[PDB]
Write a protein that binds this ligand. Structure first.
Ligand SMILES: [Ca+2]
Length: 356
């Protein structure tokens, strides 16, 4: 499939480039992810973005700190509206942090997952007939572990005290987020719970050019940990690495690869603070955050394909095995000391193998 989205051809190398893309055109001949729900645990969403409308569920906001959520209270609430995660001043977050504009990360990630495709608008998305369940866990200066852990439980269809039952438990959770520290019990238990419900958990390796083993949830057991490659198909300058990294997706190499080839391009906003300060747009961003959802979306294409052919969905371990075994080996050598998994997720190869 060569969709008619106006910016797809020039911008979305991560979907269709022969060395650095994930082989989406071919995959899309088989599956677009219809009937599957992917929970995006992130900054929230811009639910009326015209290139996302129709592929979103209401979702929920798990941030239990008014100052982080930018909401009026510490309650968790239905919906996942991103209030904006800007930080106005250096050091507000921790010793040495730099002021930044709102990321709209969750809207960008949600785009990679299921941006409306072949709709004559904007960009394309990978599992563009799936639905995104946005689960807002990140706000100003990031998020709280306890919020993220409950979000995992709920997204996967487990019970959380004080939140209504999730009517739409997700086949796949994407966590484009990370922080220092080997995985704990709190994190590990939530993740184990999701796995036990049949949910594949896909996470970003992190962007510290360091060993993923030192970060969470990258270093958690049972997850698909995703490194980042460039348009060249080689490791990005920032990607984390090490034996925990299962495979890579296109994360974008940044400025060395220029514009557009250095960045992953999806739905977002140019708003510097509140949604209202800007307008709907398409943003180029680079990170293991951008790599993860390519992999998460491929998982969704696979589940969808199976369910369509009467087949059973893969269990989490089988999904990870399939994703790793079918990854395209890197077209540029990866240094021995910085392994980033078996290859670059290959949407078509994953599908072919699952449907054998
Ligand atoms: Ca579109």
């Amino acid at each position: 499939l060569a969709p008619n989205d106006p910016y797809y051809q020039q911008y979305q190398w991560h979907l269709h480039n022969a060395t650095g893309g994930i082989n989406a055109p071919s995959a899309w001949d088989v599956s677009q992810g219809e009937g599957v729900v992917v929970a995006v645990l992130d900054t929230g969403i811009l639910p009326q973005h015209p290139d996302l409308v129709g592929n979103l569920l209401e979702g929920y906001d798990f941030i239990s700190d008014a100052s982080t959520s930018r909401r009026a209270t510490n309650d968790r609430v239905p919906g996942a509206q991103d209030y904006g995660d800007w930080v106005e001043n250096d050091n507000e977050c921790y010793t040495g942090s730099v002021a930044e504009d709102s990321s709209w990360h969750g809207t960008h990630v949600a785009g990679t997952v299921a941006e409306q495709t072949n709709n004559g608008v904007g960009m394309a998305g990978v599992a563009h007939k799936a639905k995104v369940l946005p689960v807002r866990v990140l706000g100003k200066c990031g998020g709280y572990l306890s919020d993220i852990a409950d979000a995992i439980t709920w997204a996967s269809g487990g019970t959380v005290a004080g939140v209504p039952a999730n009517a739409n438990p997700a086949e796949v959770i994407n966590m484009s987020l990370g922080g220092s520290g080997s995985c704990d019990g709190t994190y590990q238990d939530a993740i184990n719970g999701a796995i036990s419900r049949g949910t594949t958990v896909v996470v970003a390796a992190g962007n510290e050019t360091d060993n993923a083993s030192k970060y969470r949830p990258a270093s958690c057991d049972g997850v698909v940990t995703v490194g980042a490659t460039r348009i060249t198909g080689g490791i990005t300058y920032y990607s984390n690495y090490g034996s925990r990294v299962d495979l890579s997706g296109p994360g974008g190499g940044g400025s060395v690869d220029g514009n557009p080839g250095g960045y992953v391009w999806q739905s977002g906003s140019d708003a510097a603070t509140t949604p209202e300060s800007g307008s709907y747009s398409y943003m180029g961003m680079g990170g293991t955050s951008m790599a993860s959802p390519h992999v998460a979306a491929v998982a969704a294409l696979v589940q969808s394909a199976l369910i369509a052919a009467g087949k059973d969905p893969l269990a989490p371990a089988a999904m990870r095995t399939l994703l790793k075994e079918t990854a395209r080996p890197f077209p540029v050598s990866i240094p021995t000391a910085t392994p980033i998994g078996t290859g670059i997720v290959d949407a078509k190869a994953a599908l072919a193998s699952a449907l054998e």
